[PDB]
Amino acid sequence: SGAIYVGNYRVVNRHLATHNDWANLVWEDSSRDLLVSSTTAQGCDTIARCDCQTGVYYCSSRRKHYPVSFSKPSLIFVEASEYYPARYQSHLMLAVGHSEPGDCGGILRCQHGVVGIVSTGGNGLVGFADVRDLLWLDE
Ligand SMILES: NC(=O)[C@H]1CCCN(C(=O)Cc2cccnc2C(F)(F)F)C1
Ligand SMILES: [Zn+2]
């Protein structure tokens, strides 16, 4: 679990979106595993606007933050899950590192801010759904 709170937006993994998220839906993209909903209170997180390929992510299955080198956002084949069939997920960044399903939502950050959130993993890899191209979160 985990979310990003910026302005009047709540960014969560689409497969973990709640009834409240869907009733206050702003945008969703199943190929990115992202959903944004509207909130009453203002959020205090800052989205990174950069091409950083190093950062730190929160790993709930380890109660630890880990430093990682990650790939640029691209179309990567994501294995069939209980939430989605086999498919290419776009705007996904891979890193060598630990993850388990309950880790989705953990934030990946650089000096510039929130880079994205854990969305895929397995076999010693962790995939993050990028949020840096979504400039409308700033306004
Ligand atoms: N974006 C996706 O298709 C998600 C759908 C449901 C969640 N999901 C996974 O369970 C992938 C997975 C399997 C084994 C270890 N770690 C992970 C993960 F949690 F992502 F880190 C992929
Ligand atoms: Zn950065």
UniProtKB/Swiss-Prot annotation:
Superkingdom, natural source: Viruses
Binding positions for Zn(2+) 1 per the UniProt entry: 50, 52, 110, 112
Catalytic reaction equation(s): Selective cleavage of Tyr-|-Gly bond in the picornavirus polyprotein
Residues at the active site: 15 (for protease 2a activity), 33 (for protease 2a activity), 104 (for protease 2a activity)
Function: Cysteine protease that cleaves viral polyprotein and specific host proteins. It is responsible for the autocatalytic cleavage between the P1 and P2 regions, which is the first cleavage occurring in the polyprotein. Also cleaves the host translation initiation factor EIF4G1, in order to shut down the capped cellular mRNA translation. Inhibits the host nucleus-cytoplasm protein and RNA trafficking by cleaving host members of the nuclear pores. Counteracts stress granule formation probably by antagonizing its assembly or promoting its dissassembly.
Subunit structure of this chain's protein: Homodimer.
Listed name of the protein: Protease 2A
Lineage: Viruses, Riboviria, Orthornavirae, Pisuviricota, Pisoniviricetes
Part of the whole protein covered: 869 to 1007 of 2193
